Design a protein around this ligand. Structure first.
Ligand code: HEM
Ligand SMILES: COc1cc(F)c(-n2cc([C@H](O)c3c(C4CC4)ncc4cncn34)nn2)cc1F
Length: 386
């Protein structure tokens, strides 16, 4: 019949409440994995004391066969991924391990192959599956939430991961409007389309207000001098120029990029929907965002290329000579420009200024240039405002 997004199929694994985030993540693994759980839950103490690497090297190789459902496999990825970052970087002062012991590398790679995700911590692990409600009968607010794992005391990982998650959830409230958009275009329902675009804009405007909470829960000194170390990967990294050896799984060292919000499917989703061709051309920013799709869960990666197969919303609006429809489309693009402009100020506070008192991103190239290119591509998609 063809690529028609008239409904969001349950096979895309997009939750009605939390969107691309993992709904009600599992907190405990079966008892068989207690040795992994003790290490993952005590990374601040084990790293600070210099005992982390020895505790990891003492592990027996545990089979992944006892992780029988999706949520336990996602929790185990988050546990193994946090342990791997702590093992590779240690205290973060130049003494790096270039070989991941087989006792963790083998189950980590087996589980990563099973979930079609690389054997490195991704945004879907440390943001989308790394959370819980303190009280299940209370709403999804910062006060009623916590992360499952942190790297070091005072690293601000709770604030950084949770505010990223909250923004991600706020933007997700617009996903349910996508089938209304495609259906209104197919059925030539102008008023329905206009109303749907304004609702998407409203959601993206609310996501910016949610972002303001970053200042209360993250401090620049801790983010840049402490958390930054554990967010780093091994692709174009001079500290691990050939990548990491996953002992017992692969013969040669392998390179994988560190976790990135370029792996967020909700932001890539609205750029695709609005025809902001962030992945077009052969430039660095476009190549990076396309590359980050292979670091997203497979159903979410599938949702994005499915959106790309649908008719263009931008081309539909551009061809109508309808001021009301063009304004509603621009309200969506404007809300993304506003988010990106505010995020540039956040990056200046949390990265640029601390770095100046001491910038390359996950892609190995200047992060300010990447962000400004992404923002500029969005601003240039406005049909009028200039
Ligand atoms: C302490 C605050 C923050 C800092 C320092 C920060 C830093 C960065 C950096 C360095 C990048 C470039 C990509 C990379 O190198 O991995 C990036 C991209 C991005 N960030 Fe953040 N970020 C912050 C907060 C947030 C929050 C709360 C969100 C909400 C989900 C967010 C969403 C994004 C998105 C979607 C991108 C991809 C580029 C774009 O779509 O404009 N960031 N961020
Ligand atoms: C030179 O100094 C630095 C360079 C940097 F690249 C970073 N860095 C990288 C990320 C990453 O993209 C990220 C993540 C990941 C954990 C998955 N999660 C949420 C998020 C929101 N926006 C970005 N997010 N955030 N900061 C930090 C640095 F200090």
């Amino acid at each position: 019949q063809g690529p028609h997004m008239w409904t969001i199929s349950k096979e895309y694994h997009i939750d009605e409440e939390v969107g691309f985030a993992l709904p009600n993540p599992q907190e405990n693994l079966p008892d068989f994995y207690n040795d992994w759980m003790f290490i993952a839950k005590h990374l601040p103490d084990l790293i600070e004391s210099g005992q982390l690497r020895e505790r990891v090297e003492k592990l027996n190789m545990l089979s992944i066969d006892h992780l029988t459902d999706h949520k336990s496999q996602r929790l185990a990825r988050l546990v193994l991924g946090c342990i791997t970052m702590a093992y590779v970087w240690g205290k973060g002062h130049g003494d790096v391990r270039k070989v991941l012991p087989r006792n963790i590398a083998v189950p980590y790679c087996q589980l990563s192959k099973k979930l079609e995700l690389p054997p490195i911590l991704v945004y879907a692990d440390c943001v989308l599956a790394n959370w819980k409600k303190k009280d299940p009968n209370k709403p999804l607010t910062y006060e009623n939430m916590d992360v499952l794992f942190s790297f070091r005391d005072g690293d601000c990982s709770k604030g950084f991961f949770l505010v990223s998650l909250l923004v991600e959830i706020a933007a997700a409230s617009a996903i349910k409007v996508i089938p209304t958009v495609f259906k209104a275009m197919q059925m030539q329902e102008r008023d329905t389309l206009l109303k749907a675009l304004l609702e998407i804009a409203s959601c993206l405007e609310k996501a910016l207000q949610v972002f303001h909470q970053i200042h209360d829960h993250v401090n620049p000194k801790a983010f840049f001098s402490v958390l930054r170390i554990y967010l780093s990967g091994w692709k174009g990294n001079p500290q691990l120029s050939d990548g990491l050896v996953y002992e017992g799984f692969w013969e040669d060292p392998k390179e994988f990029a560190g976790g990135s919000a370029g792996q967020s499917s909700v932001f890539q989703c609205f750029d695709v929907l609005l025809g902001i061709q962030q992945t077009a051309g052969g430039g660095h920013a476009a190549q990076f965002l396309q590359d980050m799709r292979r670091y997203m869960p497979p159903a979410h990666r599938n949702f994005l290329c499915s959106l790309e197969s649908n008719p263009s919303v931008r081309e539909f609006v551009l061809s109508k000579g309808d001021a009301g429809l063009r304004e509603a489309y621009d309200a969506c693009v404007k809300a993304l420009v506003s988010l990106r402009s505010y995020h540039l100020q956040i990056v200046t506070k949390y990265i640029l200024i601390p770095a100046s008192q001491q910038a390359k991103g996950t892609g190995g190239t200047d992060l300010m240039n990447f962000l400004k290119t992404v923002r500029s591509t969005t601003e240039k998609s406005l049909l009028k405002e200039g």
